[PDB]
């Protein structure tokens, strides 16, 4: 039963939420030592 | 626009009530539903026009609501004479009938009908539908005629009326081979049909409408059947 | 002169709504001249006879302002306006362009243009009558069966029609409260200089407050000025002296 | 031929009595130095009577059509008879008409220019007839028009009105207009504010971008029997139902619940592209309610199905000579769907 | 502050006498309530602008009252504080509302 | 309103000692500074004066 799809030293922050029936995703890469 | 008539078929015991149901394909902005009672062998009887108004001589158990795309009809007590079948009538930019929906329990202006019942086929038809107690080009009526078919139901052919000259309309599925002429002399009006087919066995009607009355078939005739075979 | 007290102690009318003017005082107050509009409809749609009120009614056939001043009446009639045979002779407009302004009425029975093609006057598909009728009858419900209904509009210039009081005396030089033609207030009467016009009828001030008056009866401009007044002080050593007071 | 109302055209609004007093109302006036209309009777017009009339001149009548239908208001001893109503009762003698909601106003003044004269109201009548023209009944006269212009009154010690200020005509008069007084001093004053209009509309939006596949859904070469039908998902998408609206090449095309012409803005969650080949007399049976052996058992729409059907004829790419044997369809079953 | 008294403020009539003739006391409350704010309001409005001159007034009256006694009682060192130049005297004046 | 009028207080201030100090030497001790007056220079600035 699909109903959706949908096709496209590094610190890999991510923020995830969901209100109002949308999904929205923050990411971030930066270099450290 | 196309009208379904919603539910199938009911039974009931007297004394309770029923409820009928009748929706549209589309929105009916001229909101000119009507509601008929047919027994069997006999023509049908108007019960409201408008949806909400009655008719002549007709009790208070019977009452119609709706507007928009869904109307319905309610019997507030029923009586063991009223096993019969129940259409749906509309009007507005075409004139299209109801499926009906059937139920069983457990005069001053009169119309006469007279003409051939058989016809050899290949052939053609002729009608006459008499008028006492009106004239026929009077300005605030006009003249149908109404057939029925069993594995059709029920349908417009077309009509004719006066204002300043004489218009006529039909149906599109008998345009090319059907006229009705009048007859102010002998104050009469009459159906042809050039060619007939096996199918177009049935049973004819003819009937009066009133302007000013939500455009409902007040007055019918007696009707007659006609067959067409070897 | 009109008696409201006949008709308000009458009993039979079902339904009697006041906007802007309260029954049981009508026939104390003057004003210039009243209306009475007159007509019948169905039982249910009589609610739609009132200010601010949409629907069939109340914009395609009878419109009332946002202003109004009057009074409302209507009572059953199931047993003149019905026959037995159904009454026809009682019509409604139902289709219009756009809706009425207050007070306008039309009578017009040109053929309603529904849809896209031109009628050219002729009745037909898309081409509908703007007339139907009501069909009373005498087995209809209480819902649907007709009602008379009367209309009064006041206008609150010489006012010439209202209540039956009795009019008295005039007195001159002595704080008094009068009543003009409704107009109350307390003054004493005296007699003015002024040059009225003709025509000219009332003295208004700045603060929008009557300084003459031009007596109905006997036409004459007297001259209003307001009852003495003013504030009082009390002059007093201390108690602790003495108790004696002047008044000032 | 025009000539210039230099100041002439004020009236007594009201019945109050004011003295000595400056007072500022709105209503209809004629407004100061405008253009009026000569007429010579060396040799009697339809005049319209739009708002109001300053007829003066040194019988009447006011018709809407004229045409012994809608029957007009005459004055002789004054009879209106559309009857409704009736009444009887050098020079300069300039009178003033105008009809304003229901009340019918006439003014007079009998004097043997620039200069002041104020009318007072005379014969008013309370009808509510509709008029809108203008005819006189029988040597020079004039005729103008009046516009709503708000005007400020001066009275004297007796209640004449002898001055009058035209409060929209030149910044001088808006300066005494907003000072209260016929005199003002030196420097300078705040009158008015202005602010400039919009002139037109924008909307935007972007790009279309990707669209709806339906070329692929309409065009393929191959359809699937009726009691297999097939079936798709379409979303994430713009579709343009217009294009295939004004097609023309549809034998048939019926929507159900929504008007066609008006899905272009309406914004849904999803659709369905349900495909197959009937017999062509047959079409008409799948509509929602019928009855039939394929309504009944091999597509059976609800009853309240919301969208269109779409159909055409196709002899010329799905029959062969030899006879098509791959299209089936179902004849027996216990029960329907 | 008297013209303002012909306001409606929301009222069918500016006159509560009309309105005390012309309806009954619980219609005639609300208009009675809506006259009374906005009448209150005026007034609050009115004594606030005269307090707030009152008090320019004050310190006017107190530089007058300064000038009279270092000036008209003396002779003053303090430059331009009595006229352009060298003071050598000066002479009261009366005056409506004030003093020259 | 009500700051206005403490602005019109400071610009009488402001006239006064720009009259007594500036066109003149002052004998009022602690006006024009602390210790024996000898002159003074105005400097414009915004919305005021130093
Ligand atoms: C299916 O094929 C038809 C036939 O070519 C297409 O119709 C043409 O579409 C183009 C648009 O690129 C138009 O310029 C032509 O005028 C169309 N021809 C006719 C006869 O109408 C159609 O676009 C294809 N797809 C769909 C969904 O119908
Ligand atoms: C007066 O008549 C004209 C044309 O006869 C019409 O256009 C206009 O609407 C009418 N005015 C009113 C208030 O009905
Ligand atoms: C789509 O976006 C591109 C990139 O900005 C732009 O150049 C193009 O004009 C857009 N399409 C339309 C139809 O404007």
Not at chain 2, 149 to 163: A, K, N, Q, V
Not at chain 2, 215 to 225: E, K, L, N, R, S
Not at chain 3, 165 to 182: A, E, I, P, Q
Not at chain 4, 138 to 159: D, H, I, S, W
């Amino acid at each position: 039963n699909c109903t959706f799809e949908y096709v496209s030293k590094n610190l890999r922050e991510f923020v995830f939420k969901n209100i109002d029936g949308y999904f929205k995703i923050y990411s971030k890469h930066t270099p450290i030592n | 626009i196309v009208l379904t008539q919603s539910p199938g078929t009911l039974s009931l015991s007297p004394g309770e009530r029923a409820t009928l149901s009748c929706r549209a394909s589309q929105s009916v902005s001229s909101t000119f539903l009507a509601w008929y009672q047919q027994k069997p062998g006999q023509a049908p009887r108007l019960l409201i026009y408008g949806a909400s108004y009655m008719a002549t001589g007709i009790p208070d158990r019977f009452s119609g609501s709706g507007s928009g795309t869904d109307f319905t009809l309610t019997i507030s007590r029923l009586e063991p004479e009223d096993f019969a079948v129940y259409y749906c009538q509309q009007y507005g930019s075409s004139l299209t009938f109801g499926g009906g929906t059937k139920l069983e329990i457990k005069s001053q202006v009169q119309l006469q009908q007279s003409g051939p019942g058989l016809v050899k086929p290949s052939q053609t038809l002729s009608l006459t539908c008499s008028i006492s107690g009106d004239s026929v080009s009077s300005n605030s009526a006009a003249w149908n005629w109404i057939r029925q078919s069993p594995s059709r139901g029920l349908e417009w052919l077309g009509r004719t009326y006066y204002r300043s000259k004489w218009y006529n309309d039909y149906a599109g599925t008998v345009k090319s081979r059907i006229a009705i002429n009048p007859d102010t002399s002998k104050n009469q009006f009459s159906l042809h049909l050039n060619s007939v087919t096996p199918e177009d066995t049935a049973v004819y009607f003819c009937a009066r409408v009133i302007s000013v009355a939500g455009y409902a078939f007040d007055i019918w005739g007696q009707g007659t059947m006609v067959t067409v075979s070897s | 002169v009109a008696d409201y007290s006949v008709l308000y102690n009458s009993a039979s009318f079902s339904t009697f709504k006041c906007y802007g003017v309260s029954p049981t005082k009508l026939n104390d107050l003057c004003f210039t001249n009243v209306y009475a509009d007159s007509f019948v409809i169905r039982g249910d749609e009589v609610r739609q006879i009132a200010p601010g009120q949409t629907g069939k009614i109340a914009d395609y056939n009878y419109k009332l302002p946002d202003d109004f001043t009057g009074c409302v009446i209507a009572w059953n009639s199931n047993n003149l306006d019905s026959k037995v045979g159904g009454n026809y002779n009682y019509l409604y407009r139902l289709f219009r362009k756009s809706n009425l302004k207050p007070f306008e009425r039309d009578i017009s029975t040109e053929i309603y243009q529904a849809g896209s093609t031109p009628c050219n006057g002729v009745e037909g598909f898309n081409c509908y009558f703007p007339l139907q009728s009501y069909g009373f009858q005498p087995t209809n419900g209480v819902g649907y069966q007709p009602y008379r209904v009367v209309v009064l509009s006041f206008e609150l210039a010489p006012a010439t029609v209202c209540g039956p009081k009795k009019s008295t005396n005039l007195v001159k030089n002595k704080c008094v409260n009068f009543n003009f033609n409704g107009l109350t207030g307390t003054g004493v009467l005296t007699e003015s200089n002024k040059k009225f016009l003709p025509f000219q009828q009332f003295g208004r001030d700045i603060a929008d407050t009557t300084d003459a008056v031009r007596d109905p009866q006997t036409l004459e401009i007297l001259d209003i000025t307001p009852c003495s007044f003013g504030g009082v002080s009390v002059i007093t050593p201390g108690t602790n002296t003495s108790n004696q007071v002047a008044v000032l | 031929a025009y000539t210039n109302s230099f100041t002439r055209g004020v009236y007594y609004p009201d019945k109050v009595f004011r003295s000595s007093v400056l007072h500022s109302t709105q209503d209809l006036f004629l407004p100061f130095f405008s253009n009026v209309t000569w007429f010579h009777a060396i040799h009697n017009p339809v005049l319209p009577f739009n708002d109001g009339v300053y007829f003066a001149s040194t019988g009447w009548i006011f018709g809407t059509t004229l045409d012994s239908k809608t029957q007009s208001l005459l004055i002789v001893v004054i009879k209106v008879c559309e009857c409704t109503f009736e009444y009887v009762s050098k020079n300069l003698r300039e009178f003033v008409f105008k009809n304003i909601d229901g009340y019918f106003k006439i003014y007079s003044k009998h004097t043997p220019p620039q200069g002041f004269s104020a009318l007072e109201p005379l014969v008013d009548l309370p009808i509510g007839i509709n008029i809108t023209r203008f005819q006189t009944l029988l040597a020079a006269y004039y005729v103008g028009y009046l516009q709503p212009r708000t005007f400020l009154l001066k009275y004297n010690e007796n209640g004449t009105i002898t001055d009058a200020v035209d409060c929209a005509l030149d910044p001088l008069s808006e300066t005494k207009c907003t000072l209260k007084s016929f005199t003002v001093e030196k420097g300078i004053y705040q009158t008015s504010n202005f602010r400039v209009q919009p002139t037109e509309s924008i909307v935007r939006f972007p790009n279309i971008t990707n669209l709806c596949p339906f070329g692929e859904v309409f065009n393929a070469t191959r359809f699937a029997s009726v009691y297999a039908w097939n079936r798709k998902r379409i979303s994430n998408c713009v579709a343009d139902y217009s294009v295939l609206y004004n097609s023309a090449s549809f034998s048939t095309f019926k929507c159900y619940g929504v008007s066609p012409t008006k899905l272009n803005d309406l914004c849904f969650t999803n659709v369905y592209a349900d495909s197959f080949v009937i017999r062509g007399d047959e079409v008409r049976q799948i509509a929602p309610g019928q009855t039939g052996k394929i309504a009944d058992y091999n597509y059976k729409l609800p009853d309240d199905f919301t969208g269109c059907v779409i159909a055409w004829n196709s002899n010329n790419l799905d029959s062969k000579v030899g006879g098509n044997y791959n299209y089936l369809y179902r004849l027996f079953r216990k029960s329907n769907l | 502050l008297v013209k303002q008294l012909s306001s409606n403020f929301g009222a069918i009539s500016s006159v509560l006498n009309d309105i005390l003739s012309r309806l009954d006391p619980p219609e005639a409350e609300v208009q009675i309530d809506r006259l009374i704010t906005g009448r209150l309001q005026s007034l609050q409005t009115y004594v606030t602008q005269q307090l707030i001159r009152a008090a320019e007034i004050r310190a006017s009256a107190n530089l007058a009252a300064t000038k009279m006694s270092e000036c008209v009682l003396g002779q003053s060192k303090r430059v331009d504080f009595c006229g352009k130049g060298y003071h050598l005297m000066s002479f009261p004046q009366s005056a409506p509302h004030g003093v020259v």
